[PDB]
Amino acid sequence: KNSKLLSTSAKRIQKELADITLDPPPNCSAGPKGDNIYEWRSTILGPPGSVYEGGVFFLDITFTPEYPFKPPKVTFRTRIYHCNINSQGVICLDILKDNWSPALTISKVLLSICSLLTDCNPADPLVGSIATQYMTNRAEHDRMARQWTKRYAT
């Protein structure tokens, strides 16, 4: 193939790969799994000071062919006890749903995920039982979250 004919989504993803190589978000890395620019993995170390500290979390990231005009699909592959992340690893984050903009980048998405790990949104939960426990019994929520981090993410 003549690289002069690379698609606009492939060129944009390559630029975001360079960006994230030179200046990754704290406690994050991400890039293509292999030779397909549209299929990435990310590693997130649980934020220090949070209930996820010591955990190593793996995420799958898939870019669509019309990137940056649709958000990437980002899922957790490691189990995590968090009221905005379900058992299938789906992430309830508005910029991945109906509030995406083409000025956002995979680095900003990963920054937002890290912020969500440290500060969840219990009023828009994917896992209602966890949101309720966060609200009514935060100390037991945190015990559980640290237990799952040790059991499933170390």
Swiss-Prot record:
Catalytic activity, EC: 2.3.2.23, 2.3.2.24
Coiled coil: none
Keywords: Acetylation, ATP-binding, Isopeptide bond, Nucleotide-binding, Nucleus, Transferase, Ubl conjugation, Ubl conjugation pathway
Main location: nucleus
Segments of skewed composition (Polar residues): 1-6
Location relative to the cell: Nucleus
Domain UBC core span(s) in chain numbering: 8-154
Pathways involved: Protein modification; protein ubiquitination
Cross-link (Glycyl lysine isopeptide (Lys-Gly) (interchain with G-Cter in ISG15)): K97
GO biological process, one term: protein K48-linked ubiquitination
Single GO term (MF): ISG15 transferase activity
Residue positions of the active site: C92 (glycyl thioester intermediate)
Swiss-Prot/TrEMBL catalytic activity: S-ubiquitinyl-[E1 ubiquitin-activating enzyme]-L-cysteine + [E2 ubiquitin-conjugating enzyme]-L-cysteine = [E1 ubiquitin-activating enzyme]-L-cysteine + S-ubiquitinyl-[E2 ubiquitin-conjugating enzyme]-L-cysteine; S-ubiquitinyl-[E1 ubiquitin-activating enzyme]-L-cysteine + [acceptor protein]-L-lysine = [E1 ubiquitin-activating enzyme]-L-cysteine + N(6)-monoubiquitinyl-[acceptor protein]-L-lysine
Post-translational modification note: ISGylation suppresses ubiquitin E2 enzyme activity.
Cellular component terms (Gene Ontology): cytosol; nucleoplasm; nucleus; ubiquitin ligase complex
Quaternary context: Interacts with RNF14.
Role summary: Accepts ubiquitin from the E1 complex and catalyzes its covalent attachment to other proteins. Catalyzes the covalent attachment of ISG15 to other proteins. Mediates the selective degradation of short-lived and abnormal proteins. In vitro also catalyzes 'Lys-48'-linked polyubiquitination. Catalyzes monoubiquitination of other proteins in both an E3-dependent and E3-independent manner.
Membership in a protein family: Belongs to the ubiquitin-conjugating enzyme family.
Protein name (record): Ubiquitin-conjugating enzyme E2 E1
Organism: Homo sapiens (Human)
